[PDB]
Amino acid sequence: ASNFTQFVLVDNGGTGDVTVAPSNFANGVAEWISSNPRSQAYKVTCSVRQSSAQNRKYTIKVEVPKVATQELPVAAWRSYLNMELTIPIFATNSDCELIVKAMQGLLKDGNPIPSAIAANSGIY
Amino acid sequence: ASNFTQFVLVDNGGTGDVTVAPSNFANGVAEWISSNPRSQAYKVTCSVRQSSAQNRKYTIKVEVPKVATQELPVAAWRSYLNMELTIPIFATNSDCELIVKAMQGLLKDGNPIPSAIAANSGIY
Amino acid sequence: ASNFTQFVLVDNGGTGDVTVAPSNFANGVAEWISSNPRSQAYKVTCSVRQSSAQNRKYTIKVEVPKVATQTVGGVELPVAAWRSYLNMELTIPIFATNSDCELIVKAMQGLLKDGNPIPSAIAANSGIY
Amino acid sequence: ASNFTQFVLVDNGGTGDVTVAPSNFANGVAEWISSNPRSQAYKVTCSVRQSSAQNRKYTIKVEVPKVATQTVELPVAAWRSYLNMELTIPIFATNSDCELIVKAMQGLLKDGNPIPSAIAANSGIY
Amino acid sequence: ASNFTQFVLVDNGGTGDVTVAPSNFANGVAEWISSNPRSQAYKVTCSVRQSSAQNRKYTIKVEVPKVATELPVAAWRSYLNMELTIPIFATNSDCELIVKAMQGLLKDGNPIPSAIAANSGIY
Amino acid sequence: SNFTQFVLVDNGGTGDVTVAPSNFANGVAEWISSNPRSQAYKVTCSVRQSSAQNRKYTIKVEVPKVATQTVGGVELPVAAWRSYLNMELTIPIFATNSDCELIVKAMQGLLKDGNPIPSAIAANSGIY
């Protein structure tokens, strides 16, 4: 019943895929990392908590490294995703499924926001 | 050249789809909303700015309403997504495309985090 | 594809209309100007923001110039002798449907329609009594 | 001979027109009301005063109610849209100058133009 | 129909021209950049506002990077800051004249662009 | 000396505005179209070490609206108003002459006819 499992973070077609695997759990925070050394690893974390009388709040983070040798194995830099999702306690399973779909549609290929990010440009 | 365009936020198969359309732009914040009344609308915003000498930072928000009549047309409640993505200025187009894919893989159907959200449960 | 477009501010029957054209956009404020020099231009601005949890608020401004020529030494500059300033604030609750908003627009139109008291009073620069 | 008269605020083509009628005058403020109960009424006010040595200032207000019944049933406005208009006219303005100012206000809000179209969609100009 | 469009910043004769394209707009500031990564990009910004009762002020910035033809970086950057004040009384012809003054200032063969291009002062 | 007269406003060989060297003091080179200064176009240029690694050019241009004002009851040459350009250019000390030539071309392309920014200025409008 444990949903703390390995998954594909970057799908490149079965070959060259970036998988992240469970590596730590502490204080409600589940952690995935792609591989050692951690300096060069993709990182994913997730936690959820009661943020108010009427809301649940997920905090989800992803770190995407630029992998370079500089001679330490290091990330030349990191892109950081910080995601917060608040869901009211009145939400049904269907409500939550709808919310997931909204998040997916937001970032689907060809849509404005992911297209802008992909070009490191703004919406105008 | 304006990327401020209407798109599908919730894909339900061509019928019953939730589309959001451009409705406002102010202070670097682009806004989409599905329809009037706004009290019941899906909402999407996006802005991006220089957060440090070396980073660009996107702030992306989505509001998913639970549409109910209570007699005001209202949202019984709202789920709020607050998304922050920091990208270093050294990032190429390919780097940014990779980051988008990481975000997509994070939320793909069947993966741990979207599955947990869909059940309003935690990772354990 | 944007609604930031030129329009007729003073309709004089299609001839010698006062048109205002898009000229600036900053901090959510759209600006139209009739022509250069700006000193003699009609100006229109529009902005809207969330003013409270339950209200959107439009701020609309119009400047009508009295167009003169400013002569001092024997130096002429194109100027407005003076300006009339309209400041319009409209709050619309987030519960408003398309029909609600259309109705609000009609109320504004009816307020200022020819022959009705308030525009008649303004046209005579007199009060309502 | 007084200009404080009833008029059509919302012209719907002779059926369900919203007329507002004189109902109050105090401290220079003329008020029109559509009907009782006031809780559900369209309301219009107008006043004008010398705002500076060289300017007069009109303050014109309109309230558009959303007419509901909130349930003990009260006749109420579920909400109200509030228009506040301030118009300053210099004392040098002729009759013609003032007629021009009115026309500018009218053209601003004419059907099909950007600003009334944006309001009608509860959207911004961008 | 918007004037926020891509243009040639450095004309090299159709071969290795430096083009800059719209990339951001916020708080009245239009931004162009040549390409990603931004670390190596040419950058252009433009904004304009009422600076006084009778004047409007354009603020124009250009960044020229030194970029080779390992982290992608600029070996260094040159910064242009331009401020132009135009009175509200200026006609179309007046504004066109002001632009021409700016163009003549920097035209090939003229003293100031010749001095800059030669890494020298005028004295 | 590179301190020479040039055409500031090219009107096509007809009523061109030239500015000629008129002053040098405290590192500032000055050109003016003609006397009296009340009606003159003016250009100044100076350069200095602004930091350990940068030289900084400070370039100013004044465009007058040229009128004639009559004062009891003589006609004075005046500017009805003035447009002011203040231009600052920072160049790192590592830049070669070729690098500097490239920077100049960038400034030229910035302001070339038909491009957005000079088009916006010419209409006294913004970029949007």
Residues in chain F, overall count:
128
Chain F residue with Cα closest to C29 = F128
Using DSSP, state whether B113 is helix, strand or coil: helix
Phi, psi of C116 (to 5 degrees): -80, 155
Smallest Cα distance from B104 to chain E, Å: 22
**Separation between Cα atoms, residue B120 and residue B114, nearest integer Å:** 10
- Technique used: X-ray
**Separation between Cα atoms, residue E40 and residue A120, nearest integer Å:** 13
In this structure, what token pair is assigned to residue F1? Answer: 């000396």
CATH ID of F1-128, from 3.30.380.10, 1.10.260.40, 3.40.50.10240, 3.40.50.300: 3.30.380.10
Which of B8, B12, B79 lies nearest to residue A99, judging by beta carbons?
A: B79
Q: How far is CA C126 from the centre of its chain?
A: 21
Beta-carbon separation of D83 and C89 below 8 A: yes
- Please indicate whether chains B and D are in contact, defined as at least 3 beta carbon pairs under 8 Å: yes
Fill in the DSSP letter of residue F31: E
Beta-carbon separation of B117 and A105 below 8 A: no
Fold type of domain D1-126: MS2 Viral Coat Protein (3.30.380)
Beta-carbon separation of E89 and C27 below 8 A: no
Smallest Cα distance from D115 to chain B, Å: 13
Residues in chain D, overall count:
126
| Closest to C66 (Cα-Cα) out of D29, D104, A52, E74 | D104
Name the strands in the sheet holding D29-33, side by side, starting at the edge strand that comes first in the sequence: C7-10, C18-26, C29-33, C43-52, C55-71, C76-93, D74-90, D55-70, D43-50, D29-33, D18-26, D7-10
Judged on CB neighbours under 10 Å (0-12, 13-18, 19+), B53 is: exposed
C48 DSSP β-pair partners = C58
Burial B88-98 (b: 16+ CB within 10 A, else e): bbbbbeebbbb
> Dihedral (C-alpha) F80, F81, F82, F83: value to the nearest 10 degrees?
-130
Question: Does any CB of chain C come closer than 8 Å to the CB of residue B111?
Answer: no
Smallest Cα distance from B12 to chain C, Å: 24
Phi, psi of D82 (to 5 degrees): -115, 125
Is the domain covering E1-123 a CATH 3.40.50.300 domain? no
Using DSSP, state whether C77 is helix, strand or coil: strand
* Nominal resolution (angstroms): 2.2
CB pairs under 8 A between B and D: 23
**Separation between Cα atoms, residue B24 and residue C49, nearest integer Å:** 9
* Contact of F108 with F89, CB cutoff 8 Å: no
**Separation between Cα atoms, residue B94 and residue A119, nearest integer Å:** 9
Q: Is the dihedral of CA E72, E78, E79, E82 positive or negative?
A: negative
Give the residue extent of every domain in chain C: 1-129
Neighbours of chain A (3+ CB pairs under 8 A): B, E
Task: Give the H or E element holding residue C91.
Answer: strand C76-93
**Separation between Cα atoms, residue D109 and residue C109, nearest integer Å:** 6
Judged on CB neighbours under 10 Å (0-12, 13-18, 19+), F63 is: buried
Question: Does any CB of chain F come closer than 8 Å to the CB of residue C77?
Answer: yes
Contacts (Cβ under 8 Å, ≥6 apart) of A1: none
Fold type of domain C1-129: MS2 Viral Coat Protein (3.30.380)
Question: Does any CB of chain C come closer than 8 Å to the CB of residue B70?
Answer: no
CA distances from E69 to D101, E66, F92, F126 (A): 62, 10, 19, 35
Breaks, C-N > 2.5 A, in chain E lie after 69
DSSP H helices, chain A, are: 93-106, 112-118
* A1-124: CATH number: 3.30.380.10
**Separation between Cα atoms, residue B21 and residue D124, nearest integer Å:** 12
Chain D residue with Cα closest to C60 = D115
B52 DSSP β-pair partners = B55
